[PDB]
């Protein structure tokens, strides 16, 4: 079980996340920097959020051995995932939540039926807050159900490049990032960022109280900006290179607003329209749950 | 067998154009 | 299927078999192995395969 | 004697397995092993082509 | 084979026919540069028994590249596991830890 | 050499006595009381022993590196031996006892002429009251000199299941063995027993003396009991098995009673007509010597 560690179960270092800074691994405090910002004319006004609706999909359990946590880390990050909003998978996940059931979800992100010795997982109590929240996503998809997209990216954008006084007001002026860049970097980190084991971070976003919450999100304010620049990626429209002495650089077209499709087909890691439908209800559930 | 000789040889090198396959790889 | 251990281009499908013939709760083997009724003369001896 | 069981070659089993197979994923590796590497794990390769 | 949804409603009590799923799980999408389409399949009858009963592993292709396909299984770590006679008569597990 | 050390070759314990009890080892000591005894309305009585002619086979040296350990250790509990009582063998082993010969029985059994420099064996002392002995059982087979069974199994009875006021006393009611079992545990002792080296256990039972003997009986009391089990399990006629509860148990049918021949055919191990030739004339001087 581990039960769980108070003041996070990322405070363990069993699992932790470090971006591949090429031959030599990083940590995501240290690769922020290597990025510049370019203030633009253009502004974007920070608007709230509507609340989501209570309705996950209803109990099934099909026997499958569901790898719930491999396949939400490879939408959102994963390079041209196939089929991933497609309902079978999350109607068995809002099991979890139920008081009183033999489902358990494993350490390692594969959930089952009853149980099993040689595994060690999470307590049934950890998970249970966890399903209450991630199971929602499921039919995030349907016609009456579904979230926004242009709107939300009102908010990756103070996120990456926001100044602190510009998250403490509410207007930040439209950047363009800059960085320096080893050619196949942009999917490199990509590649990378598949195995963080995100379910870990977001199983603990939901059991963290008070306090521990106020410890929590003071810390780990890097592991998320890390995942949202990535994710910032795919929208942003175009790719320019800069040739400049003998060095080589990458510039991320802008980073608070969604071009709709692109990004660069080859530079990058490419959104398809059964993604802009999911990452969108994603970060409708984390961003609310985080502020 | 009666004169000893001498002979000489050189690697060779063989290419076609890359052929059409009508078969897919991943999903 | 894990007599199929290493011999399967399908990278994926060829890491759930070594994890599971890996964590001692599984042991796969074919051949002539060890038995309890052993030696047991029936005209003819009582081999285990 | 009465012989009340009569004895064979190899058994059969009550549960087999099937396949439907896609004419169309081949891998453009040819793959190639020994032929003891080949036998014991052989008509298990071409039942998951 | 494709029934109608006219006989669905007058086929007799005990007669039971055969009514064919599609899977089609593992598909290869269309190019980038094709006609798109308009308005398109409408599927009408739904089973909710449900159907997935028998299956040792399911679609045995790699997805670009060291990854799984989207809803793909693989073979139960039970069918794979010679255990040991009784301590007397009949077949016994492993046992686990 | 290894000399000889004083309360016994079998205090050394490179070499001992194991029954498999089937995954774990044991000592025999532990394993006889897994048994109980039915006492039934039949009645033997102790018959005093006849003495041994002495006229043990002449020297021969036929160049053979005979195995006399192996072959004697093979006939008593052996599964199904042959020719066990062919001549050779023996002829060749009477050397042994003979003062100043440059013949030397191997530590592993293996007796050689002249000798070795990367073997150690037993002193020539040892072996020389050893096979003053054992050579006699050599000849056990000649019409003359043969020697009884039906009724020195007078004595195996006494031991397998003698109470020590029937072993004080001189007759002893005809009893019925009944132990625990796991179906292939006849044969499977006897298949164990084979390695037991019972040469040492032999070799010294000539050699010890007054007091380091009272020592070596009152010890050795069941490595002794052992054998003669396994040995009276091929004599006895009707195996019957009980099935109660969810355990299953051997009834070996009469400690003390020669039947002749059988005991179970498959369900144990079976003696030939030139074995009831053999481990009589064997029975009768271990006997003797050890009483």
């Known amino acids: 079980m581990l039960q769980q560690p108070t003041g996070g179960y990322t405070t363990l270092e069993q699992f932790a996340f470090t971006i591949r800074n090429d031959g030599t691994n990083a940590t995501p405090t240290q690769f922020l920097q290597l990025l510049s910002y370019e203030a633009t004319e253009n502004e974007l006004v920070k608007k709230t959020i509507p609340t989501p609706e209570t309705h996950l999909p209803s109990a099934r359990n099909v026997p499958g051995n569901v790898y719930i946590e491999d396949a939400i880390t490879q939408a959102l990050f994963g390079i041209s995932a196939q089929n991933v909003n497609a309902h079978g998978y999350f109607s068995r996940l809002s099991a979890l939540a139920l008081p009183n059931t033999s489902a358990r979800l494993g350490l390692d992100g594969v959930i089952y039926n009853s149980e099993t010795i040689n595994i060690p997982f999470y307590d049934p109590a950890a998970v249970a807050n966890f399903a209450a929240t991630y199971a929602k996503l499921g039919n995030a998809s349907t016609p009456r159900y579904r979230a926004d997209m242009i709107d939300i990216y009102a908010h990756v954008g103070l996120e990456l490049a926001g100044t602190d006084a510009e998250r403490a007001a509410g207007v930040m002026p439209v950047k363009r990032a800059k960085f320096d860049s080893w050619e196949g970097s942009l999917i490199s980190l990509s590649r990378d960022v598949v195995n963080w084991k995100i379910l870990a971070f977001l199983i603990d976003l939901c059991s963290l109280e008070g306090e521990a919450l106020r410890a929590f999100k003071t810390r780990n304010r890097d592991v998320f900006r890390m995942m949202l620049f990535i994710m910032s990626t795919a929208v942003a429209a175009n790719v320019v290179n800069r040739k400049v002495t003998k060095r080589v650089d990458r510039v991320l077209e802008y980073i608070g607003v969604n071009s709709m499709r692109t990004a660069g087909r080859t530079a990058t890691i490419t959104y398809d329209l059964s993604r802009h439908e999911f990452a969108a209800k994603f970060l409708q559930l984390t961003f609310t749950r985080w502020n | ?27 | ?49 | 004697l009465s012989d009340d069981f009569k004895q064979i070659s190899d058994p059969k089993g009550y549960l087999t397995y099937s396949v439907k197979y896609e004419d169309q994923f081949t891998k453009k590796d040819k793959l190639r092993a020994s032929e003891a590497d080949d036998r014991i794990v052989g008509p298990t390769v071409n039942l998951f082509k | 084979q494709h029934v109608d949804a006219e006989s669905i409603m007058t086929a007799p009590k005990g007669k039971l026919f055969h009514l064919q799923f599609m899977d089609g799980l593992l598909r290869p999408e269309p190019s980038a540069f094709d006609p798109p389409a308009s308005g398109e399949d409408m599927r009408l009858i739904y089973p909710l028994q449900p159907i997935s009963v028998a299956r040792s592993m399911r679609a045995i292709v790699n997805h670009n590249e060291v990854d799984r396909p989207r809803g793909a299984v693989a073979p139960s770590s039970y069918e794979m596991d010679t255990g040991t006679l009784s301590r007397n008569g009949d077949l016994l597990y492993s046992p686990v830890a």
């Open chain 3, 1 to 49: 299927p894990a007599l199929l251990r290493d011999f399967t281009q399908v990278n994926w499908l060829n890491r759930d078999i070594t994890n599971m013939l890996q964590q001692a709760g599984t042991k796969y083997g074919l051949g002539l192995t060890e038995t309890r009724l052993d030696y047991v003369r029936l005209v003819k001896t009582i081999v285990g395969h």
């Open chain 2, 1 to 27: 067998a009666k004169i000893a000789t001498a002979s000489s040889a050189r690697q060779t090198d063989v290419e076609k154009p890359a052929d059409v396959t009508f078969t897919i790889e991943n999903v």
